[PDB]
């Protein structure tokens, strides 16, 4: 296993957002041209095992652990998000759950601050929204998903999202009701796994829904805000209710927030030291 490996994301120009927004309230529009310098992106969402290395090294206590609760989806115990006492990265559904059987699944119940701590410890950083979205798109232009416009190309599942009647029944058609291992499903064109679906992913940007059409270079998002941007959707998303497993999709939470469907991956300007 090599679940902290990074891939080189090539220098390029791409179209961020879309002039055909699917959730207009989220500021998916307008489409805008963005230039990104070459950098490195984690191939995988950060796993439980990888986060445990960080915690073993630093003693870091996550915000959910300090607060004493975190949001858990009711179906695996909005009205379906319950603040559960004792839910945190080691106990994803609450005190009597465990990660012992899921070491290679994405770490969950990590806040934006927890994510920044991990990435910086690892000699890395969070990606910007634009870096994240560019990477998500995987060298394709103006497609819904990292792989194209069809949800199930060639009749194959390409991401871990919801099948069935949300939120009452998840059929597990794609092989996973909750999270999947961080190396599940096909990679996109840049070598990234689970960039849509599985766990939501934090980015460094403050959230706004107001974007200009002006061309930008390595944009960092607005200089102020109250919520940070998250991307890519999760195992909970379904076309019928929450259609956010698209590269152009976007949502937000306060930086001290955490939940059972939200994780992260890191980026870096250069290759850090490892092993
Ligand atoms: C995090 O630290 C724990 C505690 O040291 C590690 O678990 C122990 O590892 C030692 C050495 O390999 C084993 O002999 C013990 O059986 C383990 N004890 C416990 C309490 O499980 C753990 O491997 C570390 N995690 C990571 C990802 O490196
Ligand atoms: Ca699924
Ligand atoms: Ca993901």
Tab-separated table of C-alpha atoms and ligand atoms in Angstrom:
chain	number	residue	atom	x	y	z
A	1	UNK	CA	0.000	0.000	0.000
A	2	UNK	CA	1.060	3.580	-0.709
A	3	UNK	CA	-1.901	5.673	0.458
A	4	UNK	CA	0.090	8.881	0.942
A	5	UNK	CA	1.398	8.874	-2.648
A	6	UNK	CA	0.997	11.981	-4.770
A	7	UNK	CA	0.583	12.499	-8.509
A	8	UNK	CA	1.860	15.378	-10.656
A	9	UNK	CA	-0.970	17.588	-11.849
A	10	UNK	CA	0.219	19.260	-15.032
A	11	UNK	CA	0.291	23.017	-15.689
A	12	UNK	CA	-2.703	24.165	-17.671
A	13	UNK	CA	-5.680	26.358	-18.373
A	14	UNK	CA	-9.205	25.134	-17.701
A	15	UNK	CA	-12.810	26.235	-17.420
A	16	UNK	CA	-13.899	26.445	-13.778
A	17	UNK	CA	-17.615	26.365	-13.016
A	18	UNK	CA	-20.254	26.025	-15.698
A	19	UNK	CA	-22.673	28.148	-17.727
A	20	UNK	CA	-25.164	25.293	-17.261
A	21	UNK	CA	-25.351	25.259	-13.447
A	22	UNK	CA	-27.321	22.423	-11.895
A	23	UNK	CA	-27.570	24.018	-8.438
A	24	UNK	CA	-27.700	27.736	-9.159
A	25	UNK	CA	-27.766	28.776	-5.487
A	26	UNK	CA	-24.235	27.331	-5.081
A	27	UNK	CA	-22.564	29.733	-7.520
A	28	UNK	CA	-21.592	27.035	-10.035
A	29	UNK	CA	-21.753	29.787	-12.651
A	30	UNK	CA	-20.331	31.566	-14.455
A	31	UNK	CA	-17.836	29.449	-16.376
A	32	UNK	CA	-14.435	31.137	-16.141
A	33	UNK	CA	-10.953	30.434	-17.485
A	34	UNK	CA	-8.323	29.663	-14.842
A	35	UNK	CA	-4.592	29.035	-15.224
A	36	UNK	CA	-3.013	26.580	-12.758
A	37	UNK	CA	0.728	26.033	-12.282
A	38	UNK	CA	2.005	22.448	-12.092
A	39	UNK	CA	1.713	20.957	-8.580
A	40	UNK	CA	1.196	17.611	-6.756
A	41	UNK	CA	-2.091	16.161	-5.474
A	42	UNK	CA	-2.671	13.222	-3.185
A	43	UNK	CA	-3.917	10.268	-5.250
A	44	UNK	CA	-6.192	9.226	-2.360
A	45	UNK	CA	-8.392	10.799	0.282
A	46	UNK	CA	-6.396	10.674	3.544
A	47	UNK	CA	-7.191	7.284	5.171
A	48	UNK	CA	-7.730	6.283	8.776
A	49	UNK	CA	-4.291	4.643	8.822
A	50	UNK	CA	-2.593	7.740	7.431
A	51	UNK	CA	-4.414	10.043	9.918
A	52	UNK	CA	-3.464	7.693	12.757
A	53	UNK	CA	0.238	8.125	11.770
A	54	UNK	CA	-0.265	11.915	12.170
A	55	UNK	CA	-1.995	11.538	15.522
A	56	UNK	CA	0.641	9.046	16.774
A	57	UNK	CA	3.377	11.525	15.835
A	58	UNK	CA	1.851	14.755	17.173
A	59	UNK	CA	-0.746	13.718	19.776
A	60	UNK	CA	-3.236	15.902	17.873
A	61	UNK	CA	-6.769	15.995	19.276
A	62	UNK	CA	-9.410	16.755	16.650
A	63	UNK	CA	-12.049	19.432	17.124
A	64	UNK	CA	-14.864	16.788	17.246
A	65	UNK	CA	-13.080	15.115	20.146
A	66	UNK	CA	-12.796	18.398	22.020
A	67	UNK	CA	-16.381	19.498	21.297
A	68	UNK	CA	-17.552	15.991	22.259
A	69	UNK	CA	-19.855	15.386	19.297
A	70	UNK	CA	-20.060	15.410	15.501
A	71	UNK	CA	-22.700	14.941	12.819
A	72	UNK	CA	-23.706	11.392	11.892
A	73	UNK	CA	-26.122	10.280	9.177
A	74	UNK	CA	-29.199	8.722	10.816
A	75	UNK	CA	-29.331	5.766	8.415
A	76	UNK	CA	-26.088	4.349	9.788
A	77	UNK	CA	-26.798	4.577	13.451
A	78	UNK	CA	-31.302	18.140	7.804
A	79	UNK	CA	-33.356	15.747	9.934
A	80	UNK	CA	-31.047	12.933	8.829
A	81	UNK	CA	-27.997	14.654	10.359
A	82	UNK	CA	-27.805	14.037	14.089
A	83	UNK	CA	-25.236	15.604	16.474
A	84	UNK	CA	-23.953	12.432	18.125
A	85	UNK	CA	-22.064	12.527	21.404
A	86	UNK	CA	-18.772	10.699	21.097
A	87	UNK	CA	-18.771	10.489	17.277
A	88	UNK	CA	-15.335	11.355	15.905
A	89	UNK	CA	-12.687	9.987	13.552
A	90	UNK	CA	-12.074	6.843	15.653
A	91	UNK	CA	-15.796	6.229	16.238
A	92	UNK	CA	-17.545	7.339	13.044
A	93	UNK	CA	-21.112	6.467	14.039
A	94	UNK	CA	-20.649	7.139	17.760
A	95	UNK	CA	-18.983	5.592	20.816
A	96	UNK	CA	-19.760	1.940	20.008
A	97	UNK	CA	-18.460	2.078	16.425
A	98	UNK	CA	-14.812	1.551	15.456
A	99	UNK	CA	-12.341	1.996	12.603
A	100	UNK	CA	-10.460	-1.230	13.296
A	101	UNK	CA	-12.096	-3.002	10.333
A	102	UNK	CA	-11.782	-0.028	7.964
A	103	UNK	CA	-8.156	1.219	8.215
A	104	UNK	CA	-8.013	2.009	4.474
A	105	UNK	CA	-11.264	4.004	4.397
A	106	UNK	CA	-11.153	7.820	4.319
A	107	UNK	CA	-10.811	9.532	7.663
A	108	UNK	CA	-14.001	11.280	8.704
A	109	UNK	CA	-15.168	13.807	11.316
A	110	UNK	CA	-12.196	16.011	10.492
A	111	UNK	CA	-12.703	19.764	10.469
A	112	UNK	CA	-11.006	22.249	8.151
A	113	UNK	CA	-8.546	22.982	10.955
A	114	UNK	CA	-7.879	19.280	11.522
A	115	UNK	CA	-7.225	18.923	7.760
A	116	UNK	CA	-4.810	21.842	7.659
A	117	UNK	CA	-2.943	20.373	10.678
A	118	UNK	CA	-2.574	17.013	8.959
A	119	UNK	CA	-1.535	18.390	5.591
A	120	UNK	CA	1.019	20.794	7.072
A	121	UNK	CA	2.402	18.033	9.318
A	122	UNK	CA	2.850	15.962	6.173
A	123	UNK	CA	4.816	18.705	4.378
A	124	UNK	CA	1.780	19.530	2.278
A	125	UNK	CA	-1.284	21.835	2.287
A	126	UNK	CA	-4.930	21.816	1.291
A	127	UNK	CA	-5.628	22.406	-2.386
A	128	UNK	CA	-7.374	25.584	-3.464
A	129	UNK	CA	-10.853	25.136	-4.924
A	130	UNK	CA	-9.511	25.836	-8.393
A	131	UNK	CA	-6.663	23.317	-7.971
A	132	UNK	CA	-9.133	20.793	-6.627
A	133	UNK	CA	-11.610	21.280	-9.481
A	134	UNK	CA	-8.917	21.240	-12.162
A	135	UNK	CA	-7.626	17.976	-10.714
A	136	UNK	CA	-11.145	16.560	-10.486
A	137	UNK	CA	-11.745	17.241	-14.157
A	138	UNK	CA	-8.796	14.995	-15.006
A	139	UNK	CA	-7.860	16.607	-18.320
A	140	UNK	CA	-11.371	16.721	-19.769
A	141	UNK	CA	-13.161	19.933	-20.697
A	142	UNK	CA	-16.673	20.867	-19.509
A	143	UNK	CA	-17.769	17.380	-18.409
A	144	UNK	CA	-20.072	16.612	-15.484
A	145	UNK	CA	-17.790	14.009	-13.893
A	146	UNK	CA	-14.086	13.205	-13.796
A	147	UNK	CA	-14.625	10.540	-16.495
A	148	UNK	CA	-17.227	12.192	-18.749
A	149	UNK	CA	-20.962	12.904	-18.862
A	150	UNK	CA	-22.440	9.405	-18.293
A	151	UNK	CA	-22.957	8.388	-14.662
A	152	UNK	CA	-22.251	4.704	-15.394
A	153	UNK	CA	-20.007	4.593	-18.426
A	154	UNK	CA	-19.973	1.131	-19.996
A	155	UNK	CA	-22.465	0.042	-17.290
A	156	UNK	CA	-19.790	0.370	-14.601
A	157	UNK	CA	-19.866	2.266	-11.343
A	158	UNK	CA	-17.162	4.953	-11.311
A	159	UNK	CA	-17.760	6.501	-7.849
A	160	UNK	CA	-19.269	5.743	-4.479
A	161	UNK	CA	-22.568	7.653	-4.179
A	162	UNK	CA	-26.134	6.653	-3.161
A	163	UNK	CA	-28.407	4.217	-4.974
A	164	UNK	CA	-32.014	3.784	-3.892
A	165	UNK	CA	-34.549	6.031	-2.223
A	166	UNK	CA	-32.625	8.676	-0.243
A	167	UNK	CA	-32.475	8.804	2.714
A	168	UNK	CA	-34.510	5.743	3.665
A	169	UNK	CA	-32.888	2.996	1.560
A	170	UNK	CA	-29.362	2.683	0.222
A	171	UNK	CA	-29.251	-0.442	-1.933
A	172	UNK	CA	-25.440	-0.601	-1.964
A	173	UNK	CA	-25.558	-1.284	-5.703
A	174	UNK	CA	-22.119	0.298	-6.222
A	175	UNK	CA	-20.618	-2.039	-3.584
A	176	UNK	CA	-20.595	0.306	-0.567
A	177	UNK	CA	-23.377	1.719	1.593
A	178	UNK	CA	-20.982	3.817	3.662
A	179	UNK	CA	-17.434	4.655	2.667
A	180	UNK	CA	-15.199	2.597	0.423
A	181	UNK	CA	-11.422	2.103	0.659
A	182	UNK	CA	-9.549	5.180	-0.537
A	183	UNK	CA	-8.187	3.195	-3.526
A	184	UNK	CA	-11.638	1.980	-4.685
A	185	UNK	CA	-13.076	2.708	-8.136
A	186	UNK	CA	-11.213	3.690	-11.293
A	187	UNK	CA	-8.763	6.569	-11.204
A	188	UNK	CA	-9.452	9.678	-13.261
A	189	UNK	CA	-7.155	10.832	-16.060
A	190	UNK	CA	-4.646	12.318	-13.592
A	191	UNK	CA	-4.460	9.264	-11.317
A	192	UNK	CA	-6.811	10.413	-8.610
A	193	UNK	CA	-9.187	8.053	-6.804
A	194	UNK	CA	-12.604	8.989	-5.370
A	195	UNK	CA	-12.289	12.655	-6.295
A	196	UNK	CA	-16.073	12.622	-6.628
A	197	UNK	CA	-18.030	10.573	-4.105
A	198	UNK	CA	-16.878	8.593	-1.067
A	199	UNK	CA	-15.914	11.437	1.320
A	200	UNK	CA	-16.520	15.143	0.675
A	201	UNK	CA	-13.218	17.047	0.522
A	202	UNK	CA	-12.131	20.275	2.172
A	203	UNK	CA	-10.307	22.960	0.153
A	204	UNK	CA	-8.486	26.064	1.359
A	205	UNK	CA	-10.866	28.694	-0.071
A	206	UNK	CA	-13.281	30.842	1.866
A	207	UNK	CA	-16.763	30.389	0.372
A	208	UNK	CA	-18.499	32.892	-1.888
A	209	UNK	CA	-21.151	32.426	-4.591
A	210	UNK	CA	-20.119	35.633	-6.383
A	211	UNK	CA	-17.519	35.023	-9.117
A	212	UNK	CA	-16.336	37.215	-12.017
A	213	UNK	CA	-15.814	35.913	-15.563
A	214	UNK	CA	-12.292	37.389	-15.538
A	215	UNK	CA	-9.368	35.074	-16.274
A	216	UNK	CA	-7.242	34.311	-13.166
A	217	UNK	CA	-3.946	32.675	-12.268
A	218	UNK	CA	-3.672	30.317	-9.328
A	219	UNK	CA	-6.717	31.950	-7.647
A	220	UNK	CA	-7.084	31.563	-3.875
A	221	UNK	CA	-10.751	32.567	-3.515
A	222	UNK	CA	-12.040	35.550	-1.548
A	223	UNK	CA	-9.781	37.025	1.149
A	224	UNK	CA	-12.537	36.730	3.791
A	225	UNK	CA	-15.575	34.640	4.666
A	226	UNK	CA	-17.232	32.574	7.370
A	227	UNK	CA	-17.392	29.130	5.685
A	228	UNK	CA	-14.691	27.156	3.829
A	229	UNK	CA	-15.350	25.434	0.502
A	230	UNK	CA	-15.822	21.639	0.263
A	231	UNK	CA	-15.960	19.682	-3.003
A	232	UNK	CA	-16.794	16.484	-4.738
A	233	UNK	CA	-19.769	14.969	-2.909
A	234	UNK	CA	-19.940	11.703	-1.001
A	235	UNK	CA	-21.486	8.242	-0.542
A	236	UNK	CA	-24.694	10.067	0.470
A	237	UNK	CA	-25.365	11.946	-2.731
A	238	UNK	CA	-28.180	11.119	-5.179
A	239	UNK	CA	-29.359	12.905	-8.354
A	240	UNK	CA	-32.851	13.291	-6.777
A	241	UNK	CA	-31.845	15.295	-3.686
A	242	UNK	CA	-28.183	16.256	-3.526
A	243	UNK	CA	-26.556	16.295	-6.949
A	244	UNK	CA	-23.041	17.328	-5.905
A	245	UNK	CA	-20.820	14.519	-7.232
A	246	UNK	CA	-19.827	16.774	-10.187
A	247	UNK	CA	-16.477	18.572	-10.439
A	248	UNK	CA	-18.247	21.948	-10.807
A	249	UNK	CA	-20.438	21.363	-7.728
A	250	UNK	CA	-19.513	23.036	-4.454
A	251	UNK	CA	-20.715	23.478	-0.901
A	252	UNK	CA	-19.516	24.905	2.396
A	253	UNK	CA	-19.225	24.499	6.135
A	254	UNK	CA	-17.796	26.539	9.002
A	255	UNK	CA	-14.126	25.523	9.501
A	256	UNK	CA	-14.795	23.920	12.912
A	257	UNK	CA	-17.539	21.688	11.437
A	258	UNK	CA	-17.184	17.910	11.055
A	259	UNK	CA	-19.388	15.106	9.752
A	260	UNK	CA	-19.477	11.395	8.928
A	261	UNK	CA	-19.260	12.080	5.138
A	262	UNK	CA	-16.515	14.725	5.089
A	263	UNK	CA	-12.769	14.144	4.766
A	264	UNK	CA	-9.950	15.609	2.679
A	265	UNK	CA	-6.832	15.117	0.605
A	266	UNK	CA	-3.682	17.222	0.470
A	267	UNK	CA	-1.708	18.976	-2.274
A	268	UNK	CA	1.874	20.274	-2.454
A	269	UNK	CA	3.974	22.561	-4.595
A	270	UNK	CA	6.874	20.121	-4.448
A	271	UNK	CA	7.437	16.520	-3.326
A	272	UNK	CA	7.766	16.293	0.471
A	273	UNK	CA	9.901	13.809	2.448
A	274	UNK	CA	8.086	10.633	3.425
A	275	UNK	CA	8.553	7.105	4.735
B	1	LIG	C1	-0.172	4.213	16.268
B	1	LIG	O1	0.386	3.849	17.526
B	1	LIG	C2	-0.106	2.640	18.058
B	1	LIG	C3	0.423	2.515	19.483
B	1	LIG	O2	1.821	2.408	19.408
B	1	LIG	C4	0.323	1.487	17.152
B	1	LIG	O3	-0.197	0.259	17.646
B	1	LIG	C5	0.802	-0.581	18.273
B	1	LIG	O4	1.872	-0.908	17.413
B	1	LIG	C6	2.854	-1.715	18.041
B	1	LIG	C7	4.130	-1.744	17.201
B	1	LIG	O5	3.826	-2.167	15.888
B	1	LIG	C8	2.253	-3.103	18.232
B	1	LIG	O6	3.179	-4.004	18.810
B	1	LIG	C9	1.049	-2.990	19.154
B	1	LIG	O7	0.344	-4.212	19.120
B	1	LIG	C10	0.102	-1.846	18.783
B	1	LIG	N1	-0.704	-1.515	19.948
B	1	LIG	C11	-1.967	-1.094	19.868
B	1	LIG	C12	-2.494	-0.341	21.060
B	1	LIG	O8	-2.689	-1.295	18.890
B	1	LIG	C13	-0.223	1.738	15.744
B	1	LIG	O9	0.252	0.770	14.830
B	1	LIG	C14	0.131	3.132	15.228
B	1	LIG	N2	-0.606	3.372	13.998
B	1	LIG	C15	-0.040	3.647	12.819
B	1	LIG	C16	-0.972	3.842	11.638
B	1	LIG	O10	1.178	3.754	12.656
B	2	LIG	CA1	-22.540	3.696	-2.492
B	3	LIG	CA1	-14.043	12.040	-2.311
